[PDB]
Amino acid sequence: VQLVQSGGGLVRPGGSLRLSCAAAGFTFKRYSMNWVRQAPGRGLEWVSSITSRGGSKTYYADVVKGRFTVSRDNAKQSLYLQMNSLRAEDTAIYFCARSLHSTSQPSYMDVWGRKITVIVS
Amino acid sequence: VQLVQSGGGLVRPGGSLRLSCAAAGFTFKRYSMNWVRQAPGRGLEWVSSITSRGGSKTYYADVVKGRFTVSRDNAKQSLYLQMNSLRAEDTAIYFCARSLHSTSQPSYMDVWGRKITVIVS
Amino acid sequence: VQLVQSGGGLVRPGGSLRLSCAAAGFTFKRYSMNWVRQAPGRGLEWVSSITSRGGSKTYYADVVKGRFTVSRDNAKQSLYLQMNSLRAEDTAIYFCARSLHSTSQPSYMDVWGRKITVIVS
Amino acid sequence: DIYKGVYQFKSVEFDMSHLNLTMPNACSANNSHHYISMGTSGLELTFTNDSIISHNFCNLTSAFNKKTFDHTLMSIVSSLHLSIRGNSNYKAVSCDFNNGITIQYNLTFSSQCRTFRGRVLDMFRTAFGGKYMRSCWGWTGSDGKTTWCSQTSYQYLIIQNRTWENHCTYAGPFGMSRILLSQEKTKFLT
Amino acid sequence: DIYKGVYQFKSVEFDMSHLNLTMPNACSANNSHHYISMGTSGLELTFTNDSIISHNFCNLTSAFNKKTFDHTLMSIVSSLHLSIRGNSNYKAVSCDFNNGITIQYNLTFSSQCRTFRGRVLDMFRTAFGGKYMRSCWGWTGSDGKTTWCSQTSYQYLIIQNRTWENHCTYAGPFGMSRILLSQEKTKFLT
Amino acid sequence: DIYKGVYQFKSVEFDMSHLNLTMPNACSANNSHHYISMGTSGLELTFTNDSIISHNFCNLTSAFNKKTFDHTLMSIVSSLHLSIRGNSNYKAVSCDFNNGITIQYNLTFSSQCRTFRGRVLDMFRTAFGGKYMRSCWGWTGSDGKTTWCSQTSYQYLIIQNRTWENHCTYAGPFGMSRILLSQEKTKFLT
Amino acid sequence: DIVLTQSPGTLSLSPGERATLSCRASQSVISYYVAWYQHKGGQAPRLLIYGASSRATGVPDRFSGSGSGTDFTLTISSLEPEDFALYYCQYYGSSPLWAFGQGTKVEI
Amino acid sequence: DIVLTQSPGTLSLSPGERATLSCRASQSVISYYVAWYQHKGGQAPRLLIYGASSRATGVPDRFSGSGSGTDFTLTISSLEPEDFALYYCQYYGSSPLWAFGQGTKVEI
Amino acid sequence: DIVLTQSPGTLSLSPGERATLSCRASQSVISYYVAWYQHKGGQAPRLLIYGASSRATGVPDRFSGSGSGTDFTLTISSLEPEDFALYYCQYYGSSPLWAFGQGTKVEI
Amino acid sequence: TFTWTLSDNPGGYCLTKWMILAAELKCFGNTAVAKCNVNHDEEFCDMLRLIDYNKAALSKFKPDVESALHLFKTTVNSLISDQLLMRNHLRDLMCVPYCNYSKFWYLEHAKTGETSVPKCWLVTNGAYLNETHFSDQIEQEADNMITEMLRKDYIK
Amino acid sequence: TFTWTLSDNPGGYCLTKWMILAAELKCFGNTAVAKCNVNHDEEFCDMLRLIDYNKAALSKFKPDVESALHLFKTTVNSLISDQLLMRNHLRDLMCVPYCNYSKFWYLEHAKTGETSVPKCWLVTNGAYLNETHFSDQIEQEADNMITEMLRKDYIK
Amino acid sequence: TFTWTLSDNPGGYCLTKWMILAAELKCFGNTAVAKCNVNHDEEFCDMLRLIDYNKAALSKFKPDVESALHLFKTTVNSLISDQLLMRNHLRDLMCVPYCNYSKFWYLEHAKTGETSVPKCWLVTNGAYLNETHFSDQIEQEADNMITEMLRKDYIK
Ligand SMILES: *[C@@H]1O[C@H](CO)[C@@H](O[C@@H]2O[C@H](CO)[C@@H](O[C@@H]3O[C@H](CO)[C@@H](O)[C@H](O)[C@@H]3O)[C@H](O)[C@H]2NC(C)=O)[C@H](O)[C@H]1NC(C)=O
Ligand SMILES: *[C@@H]1O[C@H](CO)[C@@H](O[C@@H]2O[C@H](CO)[C@@H](O)[C@H](O)[C@H]2NC(C)=O)[C@H](O)[C@H]1NC(C)=O
Ligand SMILES: *[C@@H]1O[C@H](CO)[C@@H](O[C@@H]2O[C@H](CO)[C@@H](O)[C@H](O)[C@H]2NC(C)=O)[C@H](O)[C@H]1NC(C)=O
Ligand SMILES: *[C@@H]1O[C@H](CO)[C@@H](O[C@@H]2O[C@H](CO)[C@@H](O)[C@H](O)[C@H]2NC(C)=O)[C@H](O)[C@H]1NC(C)=O
Ligand SMILES: *[C@@H]1O[C@H](CO)[C@@H](O[C@@H]2O[C@H](CO)[C@@H](O)[C@H](O)[C@H]2NC(C)=O)[C@H](O)[C@H]1NC(C)=O
Ligand SMILES: *[C@@H]1O[C@H](CO)[C@@H](O[C@@H]2O[C@H](CO)[C@@H](O)[C@H](O)[C@H]2NC(C)=O)[C@H](O)[C@H]1NC(C)=O
Ligand SMILES: *[C@@H]1O[C@H](CO)[C@@H](O[C@@H]2O[C@H](CO)[C@@H](O)[C@H](O)[C@H]2NC(C)=O)[C@H](O)[C@H]1NC(C)=O
Ligand SMILES: *[C@@H]1O[C@H](CO)[C@@H](O[C@@H]2O[C@H](CO)[C@@H](O)[C@H](O)[C@H]2NC(C)=O)[C@H](O)[C@H]1NC(C)=O
Ligand SMILES: *[C@@H]1O[C@H](CO)[C@@H](O[C@@H]2O[C@H](CO)[C@@H](O)[C@H](O)[C@H]2NC(C)=O)[C@H](O)[C@H]1NC(C)=O
Ligand SMILES: *[C@@H]1O[C@H](CO)[C@@H](O[C@@H]2O[C@H](CO)[C@@H](O)[C@H](O)[C@H]2NC(C)=O)[C@H](O)[C@H]1NC(C)=O
Ligand SMILES: *[C@@H]1O[C@H](CO)[C@@H](O)[C@H](O)[C@H]1NC(C)=O
Ligand SMILES: *[C@@H]1O[C@H](CO)[C@@H](O)[C@H](O)[C@H]1NC(C)=O
């Protein structure tokens, strides 16, 4: 099991680039994906989440709702995050996690990726 | 639920025309449908009855057995009666009914069409 | 039920030919086939055996291992024996039999073919 | 006849008079007489309307310790007695085991399904079904309801042994299959 | 909302107050009052430090033969009393059937699950579930384990008859269904 | 080896010694000594011609009310004694609970399956299978038949405790599971 | 063949009074397959009772099928001015497939 | 390997007399997989008993297999003129797959 | 919304000492969905105790979550120099979907 | 599909003359019999287990009634589906068509020998239901087997 | 698909106002109800049998509690799945989300009316599992029915 | 395919060293485990329910045999298929190959990891049968996989 990070960089407010966490080594469509970031000097915060299989339900944090877009493609095992209109407050390190929500398993994030850096100024 | 009548008219003995009760608003292929007539001054009498899901078994009253013909087409949801060699005794009003014969339900005619008039002289 | 024999004849050592027991009148692909021979002045001995369906497992007697080949084709309902590099000891009469090996019933050979003669000199 | 042109309607009826050696059987000849049998040993269940046993004694201390004692039949009687709803009153059950098995149920009232008669008929209902001795829903109007318990106009019910002589048409073991699940199911604390 | 576009998520919740006439019911009122009801007849199970019965008697020889006797409720009391592990100590169970059903379970210690309290609380656990009177696994550390039996701080357990007056949100007949599976499963040889 | 090319044959065997703490175990060693164990508490079942108890006394009025009393093991003994066909005669069952569980069955005739020995061997047959004490169908010809009851030449069957020290190979809880079905299935009216 | 005989032929009762009909069959009849129909002139026949004791949909409490396995009946709790029509009894099975009575008239 | 030893080698009994055969195996043998065959001249071998105690189809009551593990037999209730032939015993499993005995001959 | 409050904010304990953290939620929380994560600088967050009482894979005996349905504690059997990092408590459900605490730092 | 019997129709079970009421020989294909050896929702399958157990018991065990009854209560009773047995008792107490385990009806293919799972011929008022009383129910089974046979025929 | 009732929606059962807590009318298609005839692993089908029995008993038998209770202990218990009852009791004792039989959830097709077999809404800590706690469980159920209807749709 | 366990192989169950007799790790895929969580005809599934219950009982409850036995009698018997238990007892008394629930055999796909539902290894006369004794039965099981996997392969 392994989630592989991708994307990241530096961009001024007004334009943005998508992130990617193309996980491999396991059944991608059977797990729900998440996005977690941590602002410099701040603790962990939740960003987005998309459910397994079809990914019909996508949940966003109210802080970043309306300009972030979480999507996934079970065909080739890749997780995205299309950011639009970035802000200086969005500058942080972003993580991708794995979770499964059912009766058998309690809720937890199990297999994380590595940091993706995003600087906005 | 609704059974819609059709056909009808008058014809001299020797030639005849078919009747039609093209029911709509429910599942045609599940229900077995019958034909009931009533001679003027006489009570209700059974004429014909075809089963469902193919119409393999067709039963006729011995009074009219041999020249009548009951048939159904589950594709277009319509029930026919191909009368041949009509007789002056057959002048009556004809009805179409709906019934289902199984263990769960008792036997009863539930949804009827409206009067169809047949005149022969 | 009936197994019909085939093949047979006499050949000098070195030369060889296949046997055949094209059974008919029942389901070939379900039952496992066997080969039994009896040398003159000697009792019955087992020769080969091929299992049912795909015939994945074929068993041989160590005496004839390496030159006796047993195979079947459920499509044509026939059992063969590609027996090669013959020897004067191989001269005997050969039988084809029928058996099914499951938990439901014990093991036995119940339906047999008729004699097939082989002479090597 | 033939359905869809390539299938034909046919029926199989089981002659279950050959299951007599292994599994038991429970029959009912008519309203008054019913039969439970195992192999060749059987029981006689008569809804007779006159008494046979008059003494007020039911002791099984002596019955068990006798040379003559049928274990097959006394297993059946013990299964039926413990399927009676509530607790059976020995003021209303008389027993005699001098020669064979005979026990008498009094079933006289001395408000219809709460009596001793209604409880005994509950044991009868499970073993023999509702084929006899029941009134269906639609007899006294379209809104007339029937009692839970089966009702009898008779007074007594006698259980006696009877060698089997094909008194019925064999019904199978399902009569006592339901009895086994009724046994002591509603037993009181005592 | 809507899943896969062409399907939608919806729920059905059954109201089991209309099953009261045909099948029984089991409930707990707060944490200490519990009710088993059949139709309109019901029972009250109270966990109290207050003793109602003081005499040392649980006698049923005369209780069955009385002017009034509720057969529906005595069926439930008999079913519950027969789901207690081993043999009930008549030194610890008192009964009074003068006017209604009243049985007292003493449950005083005089080791946590091997006492008379642990056996009675096993009858409670099956009928009324594990919602109350239990401690879950992960409360005293990730390696701490909970006992097998449900434990109580109260001393006495009282069962009294009480006409049903909607003391609960109906739960269904499953409380009594689980009791009938455990009735006399561990009853001793005596 | 390999079937159809892309499948292979493999076997799984379960070691049932780890199910020792939660669910019971019943197994036989050598046709004379049989073991039923729960956790670390076990039972000795020996078929012997040697008599341990000579007195005709089996009272549990005082045995239950003692400081030394194993509830886990007495549950098994009560379950086993209640699976015996018919009613066990106290003329043939002796008891001793002074130094643990110790009960004796005479099994002496003093027709083969109608005796007390055949009834007791029915309890043994369910709990311990038919590995021992049975003769198969075809040993005495192709039309030779065998009795239903398992037969033994011994006289006495003794039950005593043992502390489990791997007397046997674990077989699982299925032996005690079959006893639960047969418990009091054929009790008498008494 | 089976014949369904309905007696009496004609009913003349004042409004607000019970009216009891009867249907008789020559042979023994399963009560599960016995239905009653109300036929009122221009209107098509209207099912009242099926299974000999079960009221259909939209059938008031007044109509009440009954009867044992031999003698069938049909009663009206309190007949109203709009329930004057021809009442038929029906049976499925036997010969012919559908059996109808001669008809009982209820009048003022 | 497994070897099946049939004793005695030959039998000479008058018609209408019992004839008990034997089949000994060096191994411990499951009685479920032991079958007996009768081979007579030009006729192909005919199955008599399978499972060591079960008569095949069309086998008279005279033939009766028996025997526990490691000690198998075969008895004829009353041998007739047409049951003079070679009687074999086999086992399935072990090495080889099918093991046949040396054959016991019954004559007059 | 739901807020997870972690107290005390920081811990200063010597190696080999026993530590007890605490997580508090505003609402009443289903204990089945409470997880603890250890975050150590470069390393991504490491799951420790999912289900509020069950250790994850490759988690030593030292880490052991606990707590009733309202208070969610985490304790360390004997803290070692290798386990100085930030400890988070997490809840799933309610608003927002994933709730994280403010973090607790353990330092020498 | 693997088929088991306590005793010993290739691939299926067959019924004997002294075993059916008024027929010399009737029995069923492999496809239908396997369902009874895996399912317990059909009442016909409870007949097969009782039939199969009785045949084996007679051949191997010498006759005895007190020992055969005890094995029936303790052991053999578990071969009867409890839900089916105690549902038909409810249908009998409500005076609606129920099954007393005597007559079973089934459809058999004209040529291939394909056979459905027999369904009980229900009784009420002490009389069997005519074939026309449940004619539409029979028409369900005919179309069920069209799809079932077309499923296996197309897949080849 | 044959249907089963102890009493009187075309092809399936339907739920009345006084047997649903907070809805005027809710019920299901033919396909889902037919499964409860054969299947016994769903807690929802135990509701259907208990609802069906209660409707029949109230209409045909006059009210009485002593005789209705005794028929429940003897006869009606067989209508409740025995394995499900004891499984959910074990899930209760271990404090894991169990089913207390009250609320069930299912998916309904937007147009065709096809409906899944309702699954129990589990409870723990005296609170129902919240709608998003088993979100991935709903997703596989939606994908399960996609194949189930597509298989029937393609073959026509 | 939803899978449930009382305790905590993605989508299926896996067997530990101390519960397997003579191996370190043998365990099975999602497809086979689901059948044991829906059906009760296979004797292997009664083992998984016993293994699963034992693992959960040990972790969450402190050791006690007086109370573990009682919960076994009242509650855990429902986890054992009663019909199978009485059948094997009948096969044991008649001296035919039966099962004491110990050894099971299955087929594992070489590449995909697909695994059949294990079937019991049968014992008679105090000896296990060789693989050659039921060789034709194995050939039949291998064809069940081919149709079952090709059904999913075509539809994609
Ligand atoms: C009765 O069954 C119990 C539990 O099924 C057996 O005790 C358990 O045995 C295993 C293996 O022997 C123990 O695992 C061991 O754990 C320690 C660390 O805890 C480790 O050093 C070993 O390598 C091994 O993994 C286990 O702790 C122990 N107890 C429990 C509660 O699981 C016992 O052996 C059985 N007794 C008999 C007589 O069969
Ligand atoms: C019920 O059983 C009893 C006892 O088995 C039968 O009474 C015996 O009948 C035999 C006939 O063979 C007499 O010789 C005995 O004297 C009778 N008494 C006893 C104590 O054995 C009785 O016949 C059976 N009842 C019926 C109706 O057959
Ligand atoms: C069956 O029971 C009835 C009613 O209990 C008994 O007849 C009564 O006997 C008592 C005894 O004192 C009298 O007080 C009653 O007057 C009797 N008659 C009635 C109608 O109650 C009858 O004796 C019992 N049968 C037998 C055979 O003992
Ligand atoms: C126990 O739960 C029940 C809910 O039915 C309640 O008990 C009632 O409490 C009120 C107010 O104190 C009293 O007027 C009633 O008399 C009580 N009922 C009975 C039957 O005595 C209450 O919620 C809880 N009682 C406690 C915790 O003592
Ligand atoms: C419940 O049991 C307790 C303890 O067994 C009883 O209280 C004891 O009664 C005995 C009777 O001789 C005294 O010796 C003890 O001193 C009492 N107290 C204790 C703490 O043991 C109590 O009586 C029982 N309940 C009732 C209602 O009688
Ligand atoms: C009934 O009495 C018991 C003890 O006699 C009480 O249980 C005590 O509860 C307190 C809670 O404040 C604990 O600190 C004690 O340790 C408990 N006692 C024992 C002996 O453990 C119980 O609370 C009482 N209940 C009522 C309503 O009075
Ligand atoms: C428990 O039942 C008893 C007896 O059925 C009830 O006590 C009777 O109550 C009525 C009230 O209508 C009084 O007239 C009677 O005198 C009482 N005694 C008897 C012997 O009938 C009692 O009320 C019930 N318990 C509750 C809580 O309602
Ligand atoms: C059978 O059970 C009895 C009762 O526990 C055991 O007898 C006791 O054994 C212990 C050994 O620790 C002695 O100290 C006691 O004195 C014995 N008697 C009593 C009354 O406790 C007996 O040992 C058990 N059998 C075996 C073989 O261990
Ligand atoms: C156990 O063995 C027998 C079984 O009946 C009984 O004692 C025998 O009694 C008979 C007749 O009274 C005598 O012939 C025997 O000699 C007695 N002893 C034995 C060993 O068989 C009695 O039930 C029991 N006896 C003992 C000593 O335990
Ligand atoms: C226990 O005693 C019985 C009989 O008292 C013995 O059974 C005998 O076993 C021999 C074996 O050679 C048989 O020949 C006898 O026929 C059997 N006796 C009877 C009466 O049938 C048994 O072997 C004894 N066991 C021990 C260990 O002494
Ligand atoms: C199930 O538990 C919930 C949570 O408290 C409760 O509201 C509901 O009434 C319970 N259902 C039943 C049938 O008891
Ligand atoms: C099953 O029986 C055989 C017979 O020898 C034995 O080897 C095996 O161990 C038995 N299994 C168990 C669990 O007792």
From Swiss-Prot, chains J, K, L:
Glycans are attached at residues 100, 125, 130. Disulfide bonds join 14-27, 36-45, 99-120. It is found in: Virion membrane; Host endoplasmic reticulum membrane; Host Golgi apparatus membrane; Host cell membrane. It comes from the Viruses. It is a single-pass membrane protein. Contains 1 fusion peptide at the N-terminus, 2 heptad repeats domains HR1 and HR2 and, at the C-terminus, a cytoplasmic domain that plays a role in ER location. Also contains a zinc-binding domain that allows SSP retention in the GPC complex by accepting a cysteine from SSP as the fourth ligand. Forms the virion spikes together with glycoprotein G1. The glycoprotein spike trimers are connected to the underlying matrix. Class I viral fusion protein that directs fusion of viral and host endosomal membranes, leading to delivery of the nucleocapsid into the cytoplasm. Membrane fusion is mediated by irreversible conformational changes induced by acidification. This is Glycoprotein G2. The gene is GPC. The chain holds residues 267 to 427 of 498 of the full protein.
